[PDB]
Structure 1
């Protein structure tokens, strides 16, 4: 079980897919037996599930005879799938005292710039799921980071997504800390609040590799992740956070997302093999999970050769590539794609 070797190195592997049949077939439970320890979804994942999974047909027909919006029909079916996956993951969650075994459901992409509307929908979905091991997924726009602070102060666990920027990630940590501080000032618990920061990998290489010289192709995303991990080590060890951790606060954990390899010239396990380190998560598509179980390597690679990663990022800046601008552009493109998938999902539910 290579996933056990990864766990021993301090990283969780989650499945970047969710559907009704994934659960009802027993496939998810069988993955957990191999060492998978969580599940992520997003609007594109759900659009594909609803389009291809036979198990929705009866419920769709029933819901079409009710007075509901298409979005309400979607939410009814997706919440049920999330609850079912949470129950499959509950033993894992309990075995670590609530530190693992999460399933993520994303709010509507229409809300990405609306902090108050995001808070309201996140609270509603949190209440609808009614599972201690559910996370609400929120894009890390400025409004999403505003919402993160509020939701953390409400005691809600959050998966902050579409991060491509080290600066934006550090802003998210600061908002998390403000929410935790608020709870401590009100004498509230913090020990069960878990937050992950989903930092995207392959899309960075896909955006840049054509413009980069041969020596740097396929290097930027891993280099950026290695630097982000070092930022995390700094932030969460500083005296400010240390004082919160001493009162029971959990650190945010980095979660590597978009770790399926899109370029056939690269090894199919490149992102998983290259980003293993302590106190992190990697969420993988099913084909990548299978490839990693088949021929992946479990080694402590995330903290290897950190200076080389910095040298590469400096060379990329010197070539006139601004990774901050790229991050804003990738976050926008990702929101657009999620909006398009969500609209596509809703159309047949009308």
Structure 2
């Protein structure tokens, strides 16, 4: 039942909605979610493509914007920034109530910037200013250029959702970049206590890539095993003396955020990923059908740290089979970028 969201909060995990649209906010639905236990919102270009195509409240806004001398991208950004502003306003009471730890809304930069660190910084600073809300996160793909940009943006005091992570190694590189940016601010006497970063580590796409060729004892296990190992890495990195010296001065840890947590394979229970990944100081962003499945028949238990030995043993067998999860991660990141660019070009066409 609905109280499960609060039960998961008591276990230390925030549940965010992996959807955004003009009607979600305007209808009052988001506000009612923010009072039932939902704690934030994520978007991406595919989410906006679907929203723009299906939500009747965009029609008048597009007609208005087509009367102005604007590029398709600016028309999109005006629409998306307006949705994000409005959602931030709905989430602001939640955000302020925790000292700025919850109640975030994320907006992703253009996919074409993913390998351009300077361009990413420029667009992220611009979108941060355009939204003009303390609870907005700018969402940046975790390419090498994105990790470069993360350090700069953190040093600028901007909260970031670093996305398209599939790799434990790349996630550790992101933590190090974050820490460098925090250290910069502390050295300059600048605030750090409101800077929040999440590392959006993708789940279902790993199983989708591998399961058809895995042996039976591993089908549907790899993504969860990776996530459990990533969380062990997180505990080690953020408790170490190096980070503790920053946390003592007000720095926040990065948090892992489980993304792509809708189940794609009908052979697995629809709550598999949510049920399996609950642990303290994490986030899980879910699509609306998964949110409703979890409310209906999910389970709130601290599963993320259970049986880490088995997770390791499974990852050892994945390697034994010749699957290099680092090569896989790079391929999944590049393919996610291609898919997001396709979605973005698809949403821009009707805005010409």
- CA–CA distance in 1 between the matches of 2:332 and 2:54? 28
Q: Secondary structure of the equivalent of 2:266?
A: coil
Q: Secondary structure of the equivalent of 2:14?
A: strand
- CA–CA distance in 2 between the matches of 1:276 and 1:250? 20
Q: Secondary structure of the equivalent of 2:41?
A: coil
Measured against aligned partners, the alpha-carbon deviations of 1:41-77 in whole angstroms (never above 9, x if no partner) come to: 0000000000111001111111111011000000001
- CA–CA distance in 1 between the matches of 2:213 and 2:249? 48
Q: Secondary structure of the equivalent of 2:169?
A: helix
Greater than 6 Å deviation, 4+ residue runs: none
- CA–CA distance in 1 between the matches of 2:112 and 2:46? 14
Measured against aligned partners, the alpha-carbon deviations of 1:245-304 in whole angstroms (never above 9, x if no partner) come to: 010000000000000000011000000000000000000000000000001000000000
Structure 1 residue 78 displacement after superposition: 0.4
Structure 1, 18-27 or 104-113: larger mean CA deviation: 18-27
- CA–CA distance in 2 between the matches of 1:119 and 1:97? 26
Q: Secondary structure of the equivalent of 2:58?
A: helix
Structure 1 residue 28 displacement after superposition: 1.0
Q: Secondary structure of the equivalent of 2:262?
A: coil
Measured against aligned partners, the alpha-carbon deviations of 1:154-176 in whole angstroms (never above 9, x if no partner) come to: 00000000000000000000000
- CA–CA distance in 1 between the matches of 2:316 and 2:351? 49
Q: Given the two structures, how large is their TM-score scaled by the length of structure 2?
A: 0.99
**Unaligned 5+ residue runs, structure 2?**
none
- CA–CA distance in 1 between the matches of 2:31 and 2:155? 32
Match of 2:345 in 1: 343
Q: Secondary structure of the equivalent of 1:175?
A: helix
Candidates 161, 164, 170, aligned match of 1:162: 164
- CA–CA distance in 2 between the matches of 1:82 and 1:105? 7
- CA–CA distance in 1 between the matches of 2:160 and 2:307? 31
Structure 1 residue 121 displacement after superposition: 0.2
- CA–CA distance in 2 between the matches of 1:25 and 1:218? 37
Match of 1:58 in 2: 60
- CA–CA distance in 2 between the matches of 1:324 and 1:31? 37
Measured against aligned partners, the alpha-carbon deviations of 1:18-52 in whole angstroms (never above 9, x if no partner) come to: 00011111111121221000000000000000011
Aligned residues between the structures: 350
Q: Secondary structure of the equivalent of 1:209?
A: helix
- CA–CA distance in 2 between the matches of 1:97 and 1:147? 26
Q: Secondary structure of the equivalent of 1:300?
A: coil
- CA–CA distance in 2 between the matches of 1:222 and 1:26? 34
Candidates 177, 180, 186, aligned match of 2:179: 177
Structure 1 residue 187 displacement after superposition: 0.3
Measured against aligned partners, the alpha-carbon deviations of 1:185-229 in whole angstroms (never above 9, x if no partner) come to: 100000000000000000000000001011100000000000000
Matched, 1:211 2:213: yes
Structure 1 residue 310 displacement after superposition: 0.2
**Unaligned 5+ residue runs, structure 1?**
none
Q: Secondary structure of the equivalent of 1:39?
A: strand
Match of 2:82 in 1: 80
- CA–CA distance in 2 between the matches of 1:34 and 1:203? 29
Structure 1 residue 80 displacement after superposition: 0.4
- CA–CA distance in 2 between the matches of 1:24 and 1:269? 29
Match of 1:115 in 2: 117
